[PDB]
Write a protein that binds this ligand. Structure first.
Ligand code: 118
Ligand code: 118
Lengths: 268, 268
């Protein structure tokens, strides 16, 4: 039968048959060489049935071409079986995050905090860990650590980009008497002097939020993320990090300082 | 900051930044007039965080653009929540159906039937209802059924292609008796007489397989489909159909005949 009628019996378009004949799939029965027409037989219906059945299961064209001729090979099906489960879990997570987005946006008219997942690699740092009574004494006592360590460690170069952060080792969020550690990243090791130490922090996967403005409201950021981990069925696994990007060392308007809070979490 | 350092602050490729500048999504702070170099600032990172945050919910570039610059436009988010809720369902069928596939393939290491879902539009048919004692007698009795109808009507033109079939109105099969109907599709209505009548048959969505060979193995097809609609969670809403494509009237070898088995189903 000619191609315009075969396309109505099969209920598909003609461009589909042209494309199939081009790629080497469902080659016609008899092509007339003078005019160039294509004539199909009832033998082609029983292969198109198989093509449409395999395509309705999500397979791509090259696997179907490799399948109809290498019929012993059946592991492509499992290769697809793992990707389907991955797709179900990702769509089931995007759905929950969209619902959380709408639930959060219900009462608040606009939103400040926008969470995002990311990867953080391994690093070498020099660090110092101690207890502080408050945050203001902390802000003033950091820079002595920076002048002093360069005094005792000659020629120590930082990394690119710069990574300078602090760890809140306490299990519960507090306002005074905080156990805190300060870390800055360098390229190579050195030797310890007094309380200043050198160590290696492993690689993590973390959820991040960026806060912009004055320090006093940073707890608000810590509110949102503390909601986030509970709302979308996640579990906080390790101590949070607070890494400093823009502060008093580059600018004078303290209402333009920007920092980023990262909670290492896992989908369990 | 130059493009190569900013690409390491954000952990993204350079071609992505070029593309985002071309689209109009993320425009650099300052561009050199003669070189053409691109320089970025911290607020570019605050915005890239928002871009990635929006991109993690599955939106495409145009909606992300429309979301960032324009008004809130909440109707786009819930409208997405349907495209996910639907998609999961779609996904949730296929992981089932492929799981059907394996439970049959690994039983025989050969596949005789492959099922596929399709849609059959509405038609105008002539039809005759009756009870049959034995299928062979029905085959023998069909040529007179053709003869009465062929003589007494002017301008009785069949369809292109030819759709002639038999309707099985029984719920649970038995070899003793069968309430069947013979149907052949025509273009227009007219007057009815005798045991034959004209009627319209509405469109349906059916699962079909194609059987080639004699009829004395046809039950082996049904036992397959009676499983396929039961395991993978679909529901049989109406009487099956048996459509005849190629037989003694076009061919000579009965082992090269070809028929099509159709089960009308819905998603339940
Ligand atoms: C060791 C200890 C502190 C700093 Sb810094 C800083 C500098 C550049 C970029 C990011 C951070 C600092 C502040 C004032 C004067 C000199 C250095 C610093 C201080 C307090 C809180 C966060 C960072 C550096 C090394
Ligand atoms: C009225 C009733 C049945 C048939 Sb046919 C047939 C005709 C066209 C296309 C396909 C089938 C038939 C049988 C023998 C010789 C010539 C025509 C027919 C026979 C058995 C089963 C189904 C249809 C024809 C007219």
């Amino acid at each position: 039968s000619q191609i315009g009628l075969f396309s109505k019996i099969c209920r598909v378009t003609i461009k589909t048959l042209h494309y199939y004949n081009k790629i080497g799939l469902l080659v016609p029965a008899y092509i007339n060489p003078d005019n160039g027409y294509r004539f199909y037989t009832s033998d082609q219906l029983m292969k198109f049935h198989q093509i449409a059945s395999l395509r309705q299961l999500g397979f791509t064209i090259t696997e179907i071409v490799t399948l109809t001729q290498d019929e012993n090979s059946c592991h492509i099906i499992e290769r697809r079986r793992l990707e389907i489960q991955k797709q179900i879990r990702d769509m089931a997570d995007m759905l929950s995050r969209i619902n959380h987005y709408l639930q959060h946006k219900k009462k608040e008219r606009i939103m400040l905090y926008q969470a995002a997942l990311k990867e953080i690699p391994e690093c070498i740092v020099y660090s110092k860990r101690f207890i502080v009574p408050d945050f203001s004494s902390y802000i003033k006592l950091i820079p002595p650590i920076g002048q002093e360590v360069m005094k005792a460690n000659p020629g120590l170069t930082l990394t690119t980009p710069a990574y300078c952060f602090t760890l809140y080792h306490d299990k519960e969020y507090k306002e005074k008497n905080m156990d805190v550690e300060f870390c800055e990243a360098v390229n190579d090791f050195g030797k310890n002097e007094g309380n200043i130490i050198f160590q290696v922090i492993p690689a993590i996967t973390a959820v991040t939020v960026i806060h912009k403005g004055p320090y006093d409201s940073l707890r608000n950021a810590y509110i949102y993320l503390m909601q986030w981990v509970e709302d979308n069925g996640y579990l906080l696994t390790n101590s949070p990090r607070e890494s400093y990007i823009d502060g008093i060392w580059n600018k004078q308007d303290s209402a333009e300082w920007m920092t980023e809070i990262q909670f290492p979490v896992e989908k369990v």
